[PDB]
Amino acid sequence: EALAGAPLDNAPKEYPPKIQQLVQDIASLTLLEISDLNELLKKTL
């Protein structure tokens, strides 16, 4: 496959896109599925 292109962010313009995927997945819902988040994530901790 490969690894990334590996730039540096001391001259920062680019950042990870998979966090883009996840955050746009969850960061538009209110505290109910956030309760889902709390419940099933502190399932383990």
Add this chain to the structure above:
Amino acid sequence: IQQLVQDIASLTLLEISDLNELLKKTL
């Protein structure tokens, strides 16, 4: 809702940092 459990247990350190950045700026 333990999908959170799996996709955050697969999360790496600076991955969690990115999550922190994004949700804190949003929240």
Add this chain to the structure above:
Amino acid sequence: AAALARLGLRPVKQVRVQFCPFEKNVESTRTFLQTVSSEKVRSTNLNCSVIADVRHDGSEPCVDVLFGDGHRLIMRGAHLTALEMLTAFASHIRAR
């Protein structure tokens, strides 16, 4: 790097090597640092320090020295080989 050891690097005050790790023109300044930071040339005087500036997006390798007469010889080796800048630095230190 035996000739620089036989030259006596002692009149210089500070040398430093600014370069980037990932670019396709940085091996020459890296071997310059490898010739300059050896034990003999760094042991011919202890009153001088050699710095290795590392940056990612600087995108141009540069070398600059300043020596006892207050002058400043700066050579941006990106299209210079190691031995050319070594004999330049050698003659330029032996003149002053």
Add this chain to the structure above:
Amino acid sequence: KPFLEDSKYQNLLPLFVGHNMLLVSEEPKVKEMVRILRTVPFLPLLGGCIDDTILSRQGFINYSKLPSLPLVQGEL
């Protein structure tokens, strides 16, 4: 060079044109090794990866100032 060209570490291959040595370090403890090679000024570290994240030198020294992993877990 062939093991870097065929595996996932192809982006680390440009760091290998001179005399380069590897710092294999189980359980990454980055602050104090920075603190021991800040004694000698002429020693670069051209980069590497930190747990499959390829990072530069100033990236390393700002990675050392990440907060402690319990509080990093406890922020979210």
